[PDB]
Amino acid sequence: AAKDVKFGNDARVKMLRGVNVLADAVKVTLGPKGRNVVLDKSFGAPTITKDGVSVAREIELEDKFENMGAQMVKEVASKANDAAGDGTTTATVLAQAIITEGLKAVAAGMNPMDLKRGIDKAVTAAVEELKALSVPCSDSKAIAQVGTISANSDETVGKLIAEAMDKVGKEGVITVEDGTGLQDELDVVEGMQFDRGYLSPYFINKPETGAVELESPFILLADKKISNIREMLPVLEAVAKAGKPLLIIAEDVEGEALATLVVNTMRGIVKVAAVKAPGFGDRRKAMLQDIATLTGGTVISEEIGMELEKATLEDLGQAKRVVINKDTTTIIDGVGEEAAIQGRVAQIRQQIEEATSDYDREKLQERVAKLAGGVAVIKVGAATEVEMKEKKARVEDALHATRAAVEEGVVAGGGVALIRVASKLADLRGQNEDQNVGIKVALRAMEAPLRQIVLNCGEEPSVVANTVKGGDGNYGYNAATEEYGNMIDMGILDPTKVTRSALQYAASVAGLMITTECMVTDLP
């Protein structure tokens, strides 16, 4: 298509309207006095959210040039989120701020390429400063405070996160999903358990639960489909002699084999149960191996050239108890010595280290938890669906910020950390005067989040900023209680990694943007 090209101040002015429409939709939500935005949906009911990256992905503008502005700053908000899943509004606010100020200096006749260099120097400096202010967050109380503050001041989320973090340990997963009732609820599953039900409801020796239960059972791990019962006989009978029940975790148990197993368990011959293997594809075999290790058994796959028939009792895993539902098997307390348990865990330790992907990382951490600590699920309660969505998202949001606190620390919120690092770099200079403005451009933007937080309360940003600026260390403004104080004492903690990412990402794009001199796009 034919293009519309626009140059210099003209192009920039459109660019900024672009940034501004997005920035302004995203700002309304900053801080405890944040407000919500409503994003429409051709789908079904609209969505009410407080979450900056949600609002930001929706903004698309009709003027092709305004649009390019908005589609650019939009990535600060987006990246901020893939990085720590929080602080996306802050980020946006900082970029709108670096760009506003920067462009105004380009209009003063400064060389943008230097404005940029100064802005990045300013920033690299601020990042060190942050790492210096950061203090570790490692007690349950602090963790609760980052949760809480992330969840727009929902003390309950704070607590629940803090609680879960506590039970599943350091290497345990926590996930959030819709709840049944109105109140939030925390499930913690003990030890190892996966997503597989009995293959026939006949195995069920306890109908009141609708679930199967065996004690001191041997476990047969077969990495292959099971059709012929012939393959079993030498084994099933070695077990009938030891007088103990048996779990069968194979790739699958089909008609011919299953039917007969079902007939055999029924008549009170040998107590048995069978259930599909966890997952599919490649991880199945590796994850079935997990199960081997935990119960001290040997995987029987046709890959190492093995036959079910040639398997003595010894190959079988063992545990003290197992529990299986319509769609959930669980092994309690495996015989595997913690020598071998700890070892296999020290292997899947480095699986994550060289997991060059994001999805190849999730699963490994899951397995680590099923073998080491525990798995926790939070359920968010809500009266409505418009409510579930927003509430769920905040818990999700805070879940992330705590994980961030834990690895990177905390600094004073209400954008005090940033305002503080700005005074620490009051003396930073670059290779030339433009660069010095460039630096000053960033220091000034570093006041933005506190300034919006305040404006969203309907008081005066420059009065609050002045008195915060007049103090020291962690003195800051409590927007919620409208009083000044020590931000760490008041429990207003930002996870250091988020304050940091918001600065980096926002500067990284704002930086580029202010060096636009030409813009090319389609004809209306």
Ligand X SMILES: Nc1ncnc2c1ncn2[C@@H]1O[C@H](COP(=O)(O)OP(=O)(O)O)[C@@H](O)[C@H]1O
Of 297-336, which residues contact ligand X (CB under 6 A)? none
Considering only residues 86-125, where is the footprint of ligand X by CB under 6 A? 86-90
d(CA 511, CA 102) in angstroms, rounded, equals 8
Q: Write out the E strands in 197-253.
A: 212-215, 218-226, 246-253
Rounded CA-CA distance 72/152 in Å is: 27
Q: Which of 48, 480, 515, 521 binds ligand X (CB under 6 A)?
A: 480
CA–CA gap between residue 181 and residue 46 (Å, rounded): 22
Using DSSP's 3-state secondary structure scheme, residue 410 falls into: strand
Q: Which amino acid is at 269?
A: I
Q: 116 near 438, Cβ under 8 Å? A: yes
CB of 120 to ligand X, least distance (A): 19
Name the token pair of 104.
């105004």
Distance from C-alpha of 410 to C-alpha of 309, rounded to nearest angstrom: 59
Nearer to ligand X, 29 or 293 (CB): 29
Q: Is 329 known as a binding-site position?
A: no
90 is in an annotated binding site: yes
415 binds ligand X (CB under 6 A): yes
Find out whether 87 is annotated in a ligand binding site: yes
Q: Which of residues 86-105 bind Mg ion (CB under 5 A)?
A: 86
CA distance 1 to 203: 67
> Residue 208 binds which one of ligand X, Mg ion, a copy of itself, none, with CB within 5 to 8 A depending on kind?
a copy of itself
Q: Is 317 annotated as a binding residue?
A: no
Residue least distant from ligand X (Cβ) = 413
Figure out which of the listed residues 211, 453, 488, 514 binds ligand X, where binding follows CB under 6 A. Answer: 453
DSSP tag of 277: P
Identify which of residues 279 and 413 has a Cβ nearer to ligand X in the complex: 413
Residue 135 contact among Mg ion, a copy of itself, ligand X, none, beta carbon within 5 to 8 Å by kind: none
Q: Torsion over CA of 170, 176, 180 and 186, rounded to 10 degrees?
A: 20
Look-up: residue for tokens 């005074």? 423
- Number of residues forming the site for ligand X (CB under 6 A): 23
Give the span between the Cα atoms of 49 and 503, in whole angstroms. 23
Q: Give 31 or 118: the residue with its C-beta nearer to Mg ion.
A: 31
Query: Which of the listed partners (Mg ion, ligand X, a copy of itself, none) does 25 bind, with a CB threshold of 5 to 8 Å by partner kind?
Result: a copy of itself
Which of a copy of itself, Mg ion, ligand X, none interacts with 67 (beta carbon under 5 to 8 A by kind)?
Answer: a copy of itself
**Number of neighbours of residue 505 by Cβ within 10 angstroms:** 25
Residue 30 assigned to a binding site: yes
Cβ distance to Mg ion smaller for residue 86 or 114: 86
> In this chain, which stretch among 134-142, 179-187, 372-380, 472-480 interacts with ligand X, using CB under 6 A?
472-480
CB of 400 to ligand X, least distance (A): 10
Q: Which residue is at the shortest CB distance from Mg ion?
A: 86
Strand 246-253 to 272-276 pairing: parallel
State yes or no: residue 413 binds ligand X (CB under 6 A).
yes
Find out whether 88 is annotated in a ligand binding site.
Answer: yes
Class of residue 427 by CB neighbours under 10 A (exposed 0-12, middle 13-18, buried 19+): exposed
The answer on whether 139 is annotated among ligand-binding residues is no
- Does the annotation flag 480 for ligand binding? yes
Could you tell me if 15 and 29 are in contact, meaning their C-beta atoms sit under 8 angstroms apart? no
Q: Look at residue 384 and give the partner it binds from Mg ion, ligand X, a copy of itself, none, a contact being a CB closer than 5 to 8 Å depending on partner kind.
A: a copy of itself
Give Cβ neighbours of residue 153 (< 8 Å, ≥ 6 apart).
32, 480
What's the closest the beta carbon of residue 427 comes to a copy of itself, in angstroms? 24
* Contacting range for ligand X; rule: CB under 6 A; set: 195-203, 278-286, 299-307, 410-418: 410-418
Kindly give, in sequence order, each residue whose CB lies less than 8 Å from that of residue 323, ignoring residues fewer than 6 positions away: 211, 212, 213, 329, 330, 332
Answer with the entry of Mg ion, ligand X, a copy of itself, none that 178 interacts with (C-beta below 5 to 8 A by kind): none
290 is an interface residue for ligand X by CB under 6 A: no
Phi-psi map region of 2: left, alpha, beta (phi>0 left; psi -120 to 50 alpha) = beta
Comparing CB distances to a copy of itself, the nearer of 113 and 340 is 113
CA atoms within 13 A on the CB side of 19: 26
CA angle 27, 30, 31 (to 5 degrees): 165
Candidate list 220, 479, 507, 519; residue touching ligand X; CB under 6 A: 479
Was 151 annotated as part of a binding site? no
Q: Which helix (H) or strand (E) holds 323?
A: strand 317-324
Q: Which does 113 bind (CB under 5 to 8 A by kind): a copy of itself, Mg ion, ligand X, none?
A: a copy of itself
* Residue 475 backbone class (left: φ over 0; alpha: ψ -120 to 50; beta: rest): beta
If you search the block for the tokens 């404006």, which residue do you land on?
Answer: 455
116/440 with CB nearer Mg ion: 116
32 is in an annotated binding site: yes
C-alpha closest to that of 105 among 96, 114, 95, 94: 114
HSE of 67 in the Cβ direction (CA atoms, 13 Å)? Answer: 11
Interface positions, 57-86, toward Mg ion (CB under 5 A): 86
Question: Binders of ligand X among 6-45, rule CB under 6 A?
Answer: 29-32, 34
The CB-of-16 to a copy of itself minimum distance in angstroms stands at 13
Q: Which residue from 157, 30, 86, 93 is spatially nearest to 453, judged by alpha carbons? A: 30
Residue ranges binding Mg ion (CB under 5 A)? 86
Residue numbers belonging to the annotated binding site for ATP: 29-32, 50, 86-90, 414, 478-480, 494
Residue ranges binding ligand X (CB under 6 A)? 29-32, 34, 52, 86-90, 149, 153, 413-415, 449, 453, 478-480, 492, 494
Residue numbers belonging to the annotated binding site: 29-32, 50, 86-90, 414, 478-480, 494
